[PDB]
Structures are given as structure tokens and as C-alpha cells.
Amino acid sequence: AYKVTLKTPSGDKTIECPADTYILDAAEEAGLDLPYSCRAGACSSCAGKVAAGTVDQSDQSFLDDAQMGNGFVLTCVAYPTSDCTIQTHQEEALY
Amino acid sequence: MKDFTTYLSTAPVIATIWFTFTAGLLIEINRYFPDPLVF
Amino acid sequence: GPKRGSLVKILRPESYWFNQVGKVVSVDQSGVRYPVVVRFENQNYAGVTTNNYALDEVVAA
Amino acid sequence: GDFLVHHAIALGLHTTTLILVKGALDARGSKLMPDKKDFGYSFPCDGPGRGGTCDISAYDAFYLAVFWMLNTI
Amino acid sequence: KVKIAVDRNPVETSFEKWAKPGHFSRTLSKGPNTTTWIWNLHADAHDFDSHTSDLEEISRKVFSAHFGQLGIIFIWLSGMYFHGARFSNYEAWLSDPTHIKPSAQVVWPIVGQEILNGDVGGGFQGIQITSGFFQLWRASGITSELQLYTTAIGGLVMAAAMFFAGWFHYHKAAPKLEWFQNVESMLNHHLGGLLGLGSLAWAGHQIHVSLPVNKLLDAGVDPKEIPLPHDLLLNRAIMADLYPSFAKGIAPFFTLNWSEYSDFLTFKGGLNPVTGGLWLSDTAHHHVAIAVLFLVAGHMYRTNWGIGHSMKEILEAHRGPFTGEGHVGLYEILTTSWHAQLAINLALFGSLSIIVAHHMYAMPPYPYLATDYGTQLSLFTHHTWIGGFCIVGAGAHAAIFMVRDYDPTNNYNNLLDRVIRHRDAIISHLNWVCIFLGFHSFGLYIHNDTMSALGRPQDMFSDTAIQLQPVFAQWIQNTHFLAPQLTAPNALAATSLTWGGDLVAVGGKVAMMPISLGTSDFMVHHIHAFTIHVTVLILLKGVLFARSSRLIPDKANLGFRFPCDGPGRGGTCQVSAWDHVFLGLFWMYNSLSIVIFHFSWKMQSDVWGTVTGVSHITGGNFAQSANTINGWLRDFLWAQSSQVIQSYGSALSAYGLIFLGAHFVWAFSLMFLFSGRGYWQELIESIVWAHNKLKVAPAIQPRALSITQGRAVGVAHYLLGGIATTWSFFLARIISVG
Amino acid sequence: WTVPTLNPDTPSPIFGGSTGGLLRKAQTEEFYVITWEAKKEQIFEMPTGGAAIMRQGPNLLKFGKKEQCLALTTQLRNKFKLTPCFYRVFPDGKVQYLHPADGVYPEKVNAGRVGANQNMRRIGQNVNPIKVKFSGRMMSPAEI
Amino acid sequence: DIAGLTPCSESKAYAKLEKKELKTLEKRLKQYEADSAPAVALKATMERTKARFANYAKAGLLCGNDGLPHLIADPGLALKYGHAGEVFIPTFGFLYVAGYIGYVGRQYLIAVKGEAKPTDKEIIIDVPLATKLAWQGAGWPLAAVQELQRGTLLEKEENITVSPR
Amino acid sequence: AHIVKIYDTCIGCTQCVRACPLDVLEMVPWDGCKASQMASAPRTEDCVGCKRCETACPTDFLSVRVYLGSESTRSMGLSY
Ligand code: CLA
Ligand SMILES: CC1=C(C/C=C(\C)CCC[C@H](C)CCC[C@H](C)CCCC(C)C)C(=O)c2ccccc2C1=O
Ligand code: SF4
Ligand code: SF4
Ligand code: FES
């Protein structure tokens, strides 16, 4: 599994997330309550920002390459591919 | 080599070769046994 | 309700996967009218493979 | 030749009937459009969304069946 | 600073991606879920702009693509020469080009295709080729099928070389963008070397090979009797025998006494009457002139030294008052968009091919070619079609550029800009003029047929009735007829008999005669004009409003090809420049079909036939039947239909076969043309219910085609059926009657 | 925030004048005008076709339809992050410089926005048109 | 005979059009040498014609006023008058091979539906499994009737339906 | 004038509002969905029915549905 350090408005919380599990799903299974709505990669509700490490969000449809190049990630459809640090609740910073 | 084997196991080439095989079958059939009507 | 990863049959008529089976990703414990989260393997005519559902629209099958 | 043409006639009958019954019966709704009845017997199209709605009304279906009928006659 | 810039081992070589569909593109690389995946995969395989964004890599891709293209063409030519060497009667037809039909294709003794190996003369059993390879090779002077054997072999080798070239230049060493951009260098290189050298070498081969051997041919010596070409090259004795200028070798050329060389650089004009081909002396003079021209031409632009020119500089210089920035920045544009150069070259090339066919039937160069009425007609129609399609492809890729690479920020007030401004007035005037043209030119024939059915032929528009005589064309014809007197004192004969004069006869067949022009021809010319104007109209609309419109202010945002923007606000059906070029295909086919009809009938009626007077094929009926569409249909179509509609039991029976089959497929297209993908997907859902009812659904989700894809399938099949129907009809008719 | 007004005396951006311009409908029924202040001077593209240069700060342009100004707002808001405010004007001279005029922008939730035309229900819960029969006009079931 | 159809082994127009054919043949033939490939081919063609005709006559085909063979469609009639060799056996062979191919198709289809990569087996194929099912597919009819007696062929009422059924 | 309707399945991802080229849509507070946001059409008389909303709603049945109605000059998108 990958250690995902979530930098949240409540502080940092490092969770373990399997390679086959979406970031958002793992966070919820760990008891966290991150934002979401569509859960289908088609909106900005679940946006985070990757500070370090890599994700695979290939099925997402809402973000452009420059947004992803700056680290933005739709946590509902993103798998970790390394230990990573992700600031949560980033929707406002996307706009 | 294995890449090549996979390329041959790709679909349209397989469809191709099977069709070629069948067609050559039937053409040779008519060659050696011309003018079939009954039986 | 049903468990995550579990397999349920969809019964919502207006759904693409109606009369078919899906996999419960999760179910919300809040007051949402449709807490069941169920993936699918075939995509709809929209290409989506997961939809939200109330408890009745699905059945553990 | 008469055998043959008679079989052709039966063919055309079946084709016409097929398209006609399809159109008439799917009028209430469809998998693509369950609410087909909400658009009346005659609506232009639901547009190009969902891959493209072209000639989707039962009115359109009868519209098509015309040609087959003409061919048969 | 022009030089060579390359990158070594850029691309590797493995069959890995070969096992990976869609790897070139992002989305397709994800694999198929529904059926359109395969379609789009195929569709975008060669859209290198869609592939990536590297101009340089895209240049390298298209470079290797051209490599492979050339290799394909090499393969084809080589196989042609191979089958010419092995399965032909070319040597028989050499012994007698007057009563042996060129045939190079033999079929196998099977269920009944064997009947088609008809009798073309010389105990040969095959199919008459209308390509004219025979006359080609005779003009080039090929004698032994061994020569064609060698030819095909070398072609195989060349093709292999070209394909290796593509491979190397893509994976081993691929040049760099600036190298691709050294444009003036490329121009000078090509302009001088390629064309000048090719023409000059062809002239040398002519002089030292063909002119001697063709001279002996028309002298009448047996083909297997002439000495060998290299033997001729060895022995200047026989060359001086043929033309004593060769006794002096080349020193006269070095003394500028060209007059002496006149033995082989003539200016006769006209055809060799005993052959019907152009005067080979005149041909060689032509080609050497072309050679010198392009050679001196290829030294125009600066590459690495102070002398030369700057395309950019001159284009910026050329600006007029009414025009603002004139020709500025276009340099930047052309240096950047592939589709720009593409569309340019396509339009130019189509126009060329048209002119090629024109001059070719105008003054046939090949031995006894004019006699082969079928070959004439066939090659002509062929190249005409090719040219028109090149035109529409030009329009296509031009619109493509305008969608993709366009940028306002660099073109502020240029020709392009003011065009974009007053496009509405432009297109308006164009509409009006096309409507007037159609009205008048069509109603002429219609009023004729109307008076006819009304029994008032006195009131028609005929060369006998109310006339429209192309005084212009006839005056110009006579002008060319009288030109050599003074405007060309060193001339012997006009370039064409149709300027006026006598008739040339080879083997009874009408080789060439002067052609008059009646009110009928007036009308048909105006028809053609109107049709072409419609085509340019639809194309111009498509390209001008490809990015926007008062209806769609954001059309540039919907990509080049796109089905519609809904049924909203009335209905957005068929609103892409893609659709526009689609329509253009239609109107073009219409145009060129009309033109070839005109050509065929006028030929048959007032040109071709057999000399005795002239036994004209249709006896000039065209002259009085063409004014009325009833005469058209009956006397041309209904009449010449017999050959095809009774060709059965003959070797030509396949002509009627394919005739009916083309009818079939052309009608088959119409279901696509009219149907609806929504209806189709509905049927899909029904049938997949039927299948799943037996657990026989396919994994890949079956999907009805896109609106665009259905349009394309339909139009392809439609044009195919039409062209094939016409092709069959023409072939059977001419093989029967000529 | 408060509704702004329109100033007809605004230096309109730099453009050479096109032919895709306004028509009778402007002088007859209505026409819209767009108001925005650019941070700098810069060239841009005309939605109705053409390249134009905006001035520093106050810039003004008028149009007939709404979609023109809407697409233009998209272009500027996503390419230069400007917050224009365009109105609805009539040959009367009455303005309503309104097209997204609503304090902020609608793409974000905002207090005060009262829901409208919102069927507080599913869509499958609609009734057969056999019941909307013999009404005062063609009325859809979903109308209710 | 049947429907007033005389055998072309008896009919006149049969031999008439046969001779006419051979006449056209010799006509095209009379423009060559003897050893010429075209000559020998036309001769072989005449041979093939006469042989096919002798076979058709031996087949006992009822061939009417055209002298051309017309076929009968009744099990009882064909059996009673010795004419099964024209429709019965052909139809039977056809249905055999067709059911074979369809059955083995469904066999591979089920095998690959029992996979994790349905699309990938739909594109790239399992060569040896294909060969195996091909070898085994002969017993397709017995297998199918077994599964019928077990009622295991058809899918139950769970396939997707349209909302108005 | 065309007709447009919102349904409880609105997950408020606004793509509809994000898609309407005519601003005939907007988002409001809500509590039915996690987003607490409901789509809203206050300017229907401007919708030309180009349905790009309907295209954009990711909702199983489209949280929003368009219904073409009568024709006004604005409904037809005429600038003349
Ligand atoms: C597709 C429908 C069809 C049709 C139109 C015919 C037509 C015919 N059949 Mg029947 N037949 C059929 C299918 C059909 N058959 C099939 C599939 C079988 C296989 C079991 C048979 C087996 C069969 C036999 C064994 C005989 C006929 C006979 C006949 C002929 C006279 C009796 C009659 O009118 O039967 C009407 C057709 C039907 C009722 C269709 C259903 C057929 C069932 C399965 C069997 C019918 C047997 C028949 C009643 C026997 C009558 C004998 C007669 C001497 C009294 C007549 C040409 C008799 C014959 O040759 O007369 C010259 C005869 O002896 N048929
Ligand atoms: C008939 C028709 C269809 C239905 C036909 C379709 C979609 C084409 C089907 C193509 C083939 C037959 C399906 C693919 C078959 C696979 C390759 C499976 C293997 C088959 C073997 C024989 C190779 C449309 O979808 C359509 C859409 C828009 C305008 C017109 C039409 C139209 O006319
Ligand atoms: S119908 Fe057209 S105007 Fe209305 S919301 Fe949908 S896209 Fe926007
Ligand atoms: S209609 Fe769809 S995209 Fe629009 S707000 Fe509702 S859920 Fe979001
Ligand atoms: S919740 Fe919509 S993209 Fe993740």
C-alpha cells in the first residue's frame, strides 16, 4: 500500500491506500470525511493538490493537463502510484 | 519474437489467415472436382 | 445496508444497468436519499460505470 | 420465375411489417428513451446527444416504411 | 545558415506497440469497450497533428509516410512491367500495332472466367488493356520483353530501397525542424536539379535511344532486326548515318552552330502521319527546352551566400494601397502549417492533371495512339477524375488548417483579414451569379425540348434554330490556324489539326481532324461553367465560415468534423465544413460526369470513325440531338446502351455484369444517405436483447455509427456505384464500336 | 454589492470594423452592450469574427443577441480573468445591463438564490399524458 | 412425369441446347491450330460440357420444355420418385455444418465469457482452445439435445428488458 | 418557450450550468445532495434548447431535462 499524507483543514493525516483503491475511498474507510458529490471523475468537488508523489487518475474527465501538471487531482478516481502528499479541500484553489 | 507472436494473435490478421485457408480449400476443391451439382 | 464490494442486482427501471447486477462500492450513513454506491463493468450509453442508488433500487444479488 | 417472384413478395411484406411494428410498438418508450410518449407521435429528434438521436419517432419509422412499401408494390 | 541537422537513433524498433492497438493516440490506447473504438482508431491512425504536438516529429512521420508511398508506387509499376513481360502479346503488337489489341492480363481456366480470355490478335488470349503500355513502350522503343523483365526487377529493388529509407529516417536518423525549414534551399534544389535533370536525361535517352529505334520502326525494319541501344551508343557511325550532324559529334554545339543539329531538333508540329504520334525530334526539342529552363531556374534564392533572394522580403515588399499590410506574415504562416502547403499542392496538382488530359487528347504523342479511341477516352476520364478529387481534397485540408492552425494575433490587417471582413458580400455575389448561370444554361435545353414536344422547333435554340455561336472560340481557332504565317515564321504546322486544316489517317481510323463549335457546344460549355461555379460556391462557404457564423459565433470550438449542435434554435443539422466538402464531392461528381458525357458524344459524332469520307461513329447526330435533352438521352445513352446490354456470352460480358453490380451498390448507398443512427441504435438494442436472450452478447458494446461516419460510408458507396456504372458502360461500348 | 449602471461614453476597443455587424433588430427590438475594464491593452478576437484590441480599463461593445456577449464573457473570463457586466438595452434607451448580472457569478452557490423550475422529485415519477388530455393547450406531463 | 415434367434424359430440348452449346464451341474453336493452347482449352471445354450433360442425364432429372432441370420440393414426392439426391441430402448436410459452426461459436463464446478480459479475448483469440473446441464440436447435436433435456441451453427471464416490456 | 426541469438526482456538479451557453441555469443552496447545491433555471425564456446542459449532467437520468416549446425570436437565436 502507499502512505498518503493528507494535508487537510484539520491537520495532516497519513493513511495507507492500496494501489487498487481510490484515494477518496481509502480516506472514507479510514474514517475521514472529504468532499465529494458525483464520484465519477466529472466535477471538482473532490479536488486535492498533489504536493509530492504520483497518482493515476486516468479515468478522470474534468481536469485539463495544466491543472494536473500543477498537482490537481480528483480524489474520487485517483489511485496512488507512490507514497504521496495531497492537500485536500482544494476545489476553491482550482477556481 | 514474443511481440511478433502477439502481433499475429491480433484479431484482423487471424480473420485474414482463416479466410485465406478456407478459400484456398474450396478453390482447390473445385479444381480437382469440377462441376458439382448433386449429392 | 449492504457491504462495500458486495454484489447487488439493480432494480431502478430508468437505470442503464436495470435488471442487472452491480458492485456496492459503499453506502453512505448520512441522510442521502440514495446512499448505495455501485460500480459496473459495462458502461452506459454515457460511458459511466457507477451510479448512486437508494436501498430499495438494489438487492444483494 | 413465378416461384421466385412470389418469394420476393413475401419477403417485402415481411420487411414492411417488421419496420412498421417496430416503430408502432416502441412508441411508448425505449431503452434509449423510456419516456418516448412524452414527445407525442411526432417530435423531430432528441438531437445528437447520447451518440446521436436520428429518426427516432415512430412517425419517422412509418416515414421509412413508406419506401419499402413502394418497392414491394 | 543552411546545413544538415539530424537526430540519431530517435525511435527504436520493436513489435511491442505492434501488439498494442491505439498506442499512437491517448484515448484509443485505452482499448475498446464499444464498437466505434475500432472505427475511430482507424480514422485517426494518420492524423499526426492529433498524435502529438511536435512539429518536427510530425514532419518526420509524414516524411517516412511519403517514403512508404513511393515504395507502394514502385511495387505497382514493377508488377505492371512484370505482367507485361510475362503475360502479354506486346511483341506481336510491335510487329503489328495496327491489328493487334494490347492485352496483358490472362485468367485461369476455371468455372467460367476463362471465356473472358478473348481474341485480341496474334493468337493471344487475354483482356485488352486500355492503359496504352504498348504505345508507351514503342515510343520509348522497348523491343524485347526481356527489357520489361529487367525493368520490373529494378522496380522491386527500388521499392525495397525506399521502404528501408523510410525505416532508417524514422528510427535511425531523423532530421531536425530547422533542416525541414530551410525552404529556399529546398526550392532551389528541387526547381533546378529534379526537373531540369530529369527532363535532360529523358531527352538524352530520347536522342540516343528512342529516336533512332523509333525512326527505324517507322522505317519498317523488323523489331528484332534493329541493333541494340548500347551498340548504337558505341557506334557513332550509324548515328551519323541517321543524322550526319553526329559525324561532327559535339564540337558544333561548342561552336554555337545549333543550326546543323536541326536534323533532330525540328519544329514541324503536327503528328507523324504514318504513325499518328508527335514528331520525336520535336518532342526531344521540347524536353531539352524544359530542361534548360528548369536548370537556369533552380538558382533563384539565397542559401549560404550573399547572392540570392528572400521570399519573405519580396512578399513583404509586394503591398498595394487598397490592401493594407499586403503580403506580410504569409511567410510565417506557410512556414508553420502542413495543411496549408498540402491544400495548395493538391489544388495545383488536380488542375495540372486536368490540363494533362486535355493536351494529351489534343495532340497525342504516342505511336498509333489516336487510333486507340478507347485508350484515349479511358486515360482522359481517369485523369480528369483524379484531378477533381485532388481539388476537393485541397479544399478539405485548407478548411482543416483554418480550423486548427489559424491565429488572428499574427495576421492583423492582411488580405486574409479583409477577406474575413467582407466575406458576406463576397459569398452573396457568388450566390447570385451561380443562380443566374443555372437558370439560363438549364432553361436553354429545357425550352428546346419544350418547343420540340410542342412541335415548334422553329422556336428552339439550335445551330439551325435561334443560334448562339461561340464566335470567340471559332475566331481564336482560326487565329491559331493562321498564327504560324507571321506570329510563328519558323513553324511548319499548327500544334493541332483542330485549329483547322486537313485530316490525318492511320489505318482508316480517324486519327485527328479539325473540330467546329456550334451553339450546342456553346450551351454545354456554359453548363460546365455553371456547375463548376456551384462547386466553388459550396467549398468557399465551408472554408469561410468554418470557424464562425452569425448563427454559430463559436464554430471554431466544435472541431473540424462534428455532427451538429443539436436540434435547438431550429436545428443545427449538417453545419461543419466537413459537411460542406461532403456536399462539394456531390456537386463535383455531377460536374465531371456531365463533362465526360460531352466529351464522349462529341468525339463519337464529329471526330472519330473510319475514313474511306468520314464514317463517323454516330454520324454527327450530336450536332442536332444535343440541343434537346430528349435527343441526349435517346440518341446518346439509349443508343450506345446496346453494346453493354447485349454483351453477354462474350468476353466483355463482365462489363454488363459490373454495370448491374454498380447499379446495385449505388442504390445500396442510399440507405445510409437517408437513415438515422438513432433508429439504428434502437434496432441494435432490440437485437442485443435477442442475443442476450441466448447468452450470446459480445463484450464490445455494439454501437450505431456517428452521424459523420454514416454520411461518409453512404457517400463513398454512392460515388463508387456511379463511377463504376459509367466506367463499365464506356468500356463495353468503345471496345465494341471502336 | 449593488447593480451597476451603464455609461454610454466608454472608449470602445480597437477594431477595424467588420461586416458581421448589427442589423435592423438593434434599432427595432433591443440590443445588448458589454462592459468590462481590462488591466492592460491587448489584442483579442471578435466572436462575430475579427481581431480587435482592447484598451486599458474601460472598454465597451454592443451586440444584438445574448450568445455573442456570453461567449465573449467566457473568452475574457477564461483567458484574461475579467469580470464584465453586460446589460440589456432597447431602442427606448432603457438599459438592464443584465446577462449574468446577479451580484457574483452563478457557477458558485450563493445565499439568496431561490430555486426555480426545480421538480423536487425524481423524473420517473411523472404521470402518463393520458391525464394531461383535454387541457387548454398542448401541455407535457412534466409540466406538472 | 411429375407436373408433366419429362426427364431431360428423355427431353429433346436438352440434347438440342447441348448440341447448340457444342456448336458455339466448335465455332470459336475453328479459328486456331490444333496444338494451340486455346484450341486444346476449347476442346477440354467441350469435353466438360458433354460430361456434365451425361451426368445430368444419368441423374434422371426432370427437365421441361426448356430441357432445363427443375427441382422438386416434397419429401414424399422426392422419395417416391427417387429425387432426394437433389434437395434432401444437400439441406441435411447444410444444417449439419451450420449447427456445428454455431454451436462451436457459442462454445468459445461461453469459454471466453468465463474470463476476466472479455474484450481482450474478443480481440485476441485462444488458438489452442479454439482448436480443441473445433475438434470436439462434432458432437454438437447430441450435446445440444442433452442440454435441452436438462433445459440448460436457454437464458432465464433475467435479461434486460425495455421499460414498457 | 422551451421547458427545462430539475430532478432530485442533481449532484450539483454544475456541469449543466457550466454548459448552458445562454446562462439559463444557475446553482442554488440545497440539502438533497452532498454538494448541498441544486441546479436552477430562472432564465428559461432564453434557453434555445441547445441542451448542452443535458449533455453535461452526469446524472443517471439527466438531473435536468429540456423540453422544446413555442418559438420567440430569442428562442430561435435570431440576431435579425
Ligand atoms: C412445407 C410444407 C409442405 C407442403 C406444402 C407439402 C406438400 C406435399 N406433401 Mg408433404 N411433407 C412436408 C412438407 C410439406 N409437404 C414435410 C416437411 C414432410 C416430412 C415429414 C413431408 C412429408 C410428406 C410425405 C411423406 C408425403 C408428402 C406428400 C406431399 C404432397 C401431397 C400431400 C400434401 O398435400 O401434403 C400437404 C403438406 C403438408 C400437410 C405439410 C406438412 C407435412 C407433414 C409433416 C407430412 C405430410 C404427409 C402427407 C399428408 C402424405 C400424403 C400422402 C398421399 C399419397 C395421401 C404435397 C406436394 C405426399 C406425396 O408425395 O404426394 C405425392 C407424401 O406421400 N409430404
Ligand atoms: C445499416 C446502418 C447502421 C447499422 C450498421 C452498422 C452499425 C454497421 C455494421 C458493420 C458490421 C457488420 C459490424 C461489425 C462486425 C464485426 C467485425 C464482427 C465480426 C464479423 C465477421 C464477419 C468478420 C447504422 O448504424 C447507421 C448509422 C448511421 C447512418 C446509417 C446507418 C446504417 O445505414
Ligand atoms: S437547453 Fe441549451 S440554453 Fe438551455 S440549459 Fe441546455 S444548453 Fe443551456
Ligand atoms: S444537472 Fe448534472 S451537472 Fe448540472 S448541477 Fe445537476 S448534477 Fe450537476
Ligand atoms: S466527486 Fe466529482 S469528480 Fe470526484
PDB file of N, CA and C in Angstrom, chain E residues 44-65:
ATOM      1  N   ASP E  44      -8.099   7.796 -37.115  1.00  0.00           N
ATOM      2  CA  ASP E  44      -7.117   8.751 -36.642  1.00  0.00           C
ATOM      3  C   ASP E  44      -5.699   8.225 -36.757  1.00  0.00           C
ATOM      4  N   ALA E  45      -5.521   7.081 -37.418  1.00  0.00           N
ATOM      5  CA  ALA E  45      -4.211   6.449 -37.479  1.00  0.00           C
ATOM      6  C   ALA E  45      -3.169   7.373 -38.086  1.00  0.00           C
ATOM      7  N   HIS E  46      -3.570   8.212 -39.032  1.00  0.00           N
ATOM      8  CA  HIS E  46      -2.620   9.064 -39.730  1.00  0.00           C
ATOM      9  C   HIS E  46      -2.917  10.535 -39.506  1.00  0.00           C
ATOM     10  N   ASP E  47      -3.526  10.868 -38.374  1.00  0.00           N
ATOM     11  CA  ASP E  47      -3.697  12.271 -38.006  1.00  0.00           C
ATOM     12  C   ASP E  47      -2.581  12.615 -37.025  1.00  0.00           C
ATOM     13  N   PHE E  48      -1.422  12.960 -37.580  1.00  0.00           N
ATOM     14  CA  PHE E  48      -0.252  13.174 -36.741  1.00  0.00           C
ATOM     15  C   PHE E  48      -0.379  14.450 -35.928  1.00  0.00           C
ATOM     16  N   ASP E  49      -1.153  15.421 -36.408  1.00  0.00           N
ATOM     17  CA  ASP E  49      -1.473  16.551 -35.553  1.00  0.00           C
ATOM     18  C   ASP E  49      -2.242  16.097 -34.323  1.00  0.00           C
ATOM     19  N   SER E  50      -3.127  15.115 -34.483  1.00  0.00           N
ATOM     20  CA  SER E  50      -3.821  14.564 -33.326  1.00  0.00           C
ATOM     21  C   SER E  50      -2.888  13.718 -32.479  1.00  0.00           C
ATOM     22  N   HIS E  51      -1.928  13.058 -33.126  1.00  0.00           N
ATOM     23  CA  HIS E  51      -0.967  12.225 -32.418  1.00  0.00           C
ATOM     24  C   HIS E  51      -0.271  13.007 -31.317  1.00  0.00           C
ATOM     25  N   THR E  52       0.322  14.140 -31.666  1.00  0.00           N
ATOM     26  CA  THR E  52       1.093  14.914 -30.706  1.00  0.00           C
ATOM     27  C   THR E  52       1.102  16.379 -31.115  1.00  0.00           C
ATOM     28  N   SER E  53       2.122  17.093 -30.639  1.00  0.00           N
ATOM     29  CA  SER E  53       2.291  18.498 -30.953  1.00  0.00           C
ATOM     30  C   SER E  53       3.655  18.851 -31.526  1.00  0.00           C
ATOM     31  N   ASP E  54       4.603  17.919 -31.561  1.00  0.00           N
ATOM     32  CA  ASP E  54       5.918  18.244 -32.103  1.00  0.00           C
ATOM     33  C   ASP E  54       5.821  18.420 -33.608  1.00  0.00           C
ATOM     34  N   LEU E  55       6.013  19.657 -34.060  1.00  0.00           N
ATOM     35  CA  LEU E  55       6.136  19.906 -35.487  1.00  0.00           C
ATOM     36  C   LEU E  55       7.198  19.011 -36.101  1.00  0.00           C
ATOM     37  N   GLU E  56       8.347  18.890 -35.438  1.00  0.00           N
ATOM     38  CA  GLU E  56       9.457  18.136 -36.009  1.00  0.00           C
ATOM     39  C   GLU E  56       9.108  16.662 -36.143  1.00  0.00           C
ATOM     40  N   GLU E  57       8.588  16.065 -35.073  1.00  0.00           N
ATOM     41  CA  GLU E  57       8.227  14.656 -35.136  1.00  0.00           C
ATOM     42  C   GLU E  57       7.135  14.419 -36.165  1.00  0.00           C
ATOM     43  N   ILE E  58       6.177  15.338 -36.265  1.00  0.00           N
ATOM     44  CA  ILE E  58       5.138  15.185 -37.274  1.00  0.00           C
ATOM     45  C   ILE E  58       5.742  15.250 -38.669  1.00  0.00           C
ATOM     46  N   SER E  59       6.705  16.147 -38.866  1.00  0.00           N
ATOM     47  CA  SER E  59       7.415  16.213 -40.136  1.00  0.00           C
ATOM     48  C   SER E  59       8.099  14.895 -40.440  1.00  0.00           C
ATOM     49  N   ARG E  60       8.720  14.296 -39.433  1.00  0.00           N
ATOM     50  CA  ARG E  60       9.404  13.028 -39.647  1.00  0.00           C
ATOM     51  C   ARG E  60       8.410  11.923 -39.976  1.00  0.00           C
ATOM     52  N   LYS E  61       7.273  11.923 -39.284  1.00  0.00           N
ATOM     53  CA  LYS E  61       6.214  10.972 -39.579  1.00  0.00           C
ATOM     54  C   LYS E  61       5.787  11.076 -41.033  1.00  0.00           C
ATOM     55  N   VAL E  62       5.445  12.286 -41.478  1.00  0.00           N
ATOM     56  CA  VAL E  62       4.981  12.438 -42.851  1.00  0.00           C
ATOM     57  C   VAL E  62       6.104  12.138 -43.831  1.00  0.00           C
ATOM     58  N   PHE E  63       7.351  12.392 -43.443  1.00  0.00           N
ATOM     59  CA  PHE E  63       8.474  12.075 -44.311  1.00  0.00           C
ATOM     60  C   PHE E  63       8.528  10.581 -44.588  1.00  0.00           C
ATOM     61  N   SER E  64       8.553   9.786 -43.525  1.00  0.00           N
ATOM     62  CA  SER E  64       8.509   8.340 -43.689  1.00  0.00           C
ATOM     63  C   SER E  64       7.250   7.897 -44.421  1.00  0.00           C
ATOM     64  N   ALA E  65       6.139   8.601 -44.207  1.00  0.00           N
ATOM     65  CA  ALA E  65       4.903   8.258 -44.899  1.00  0.00           C
ATOM     66  C   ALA E  65       5.073   8.407 -46.400  1.00  0.00           C
TER      67      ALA E  65
END
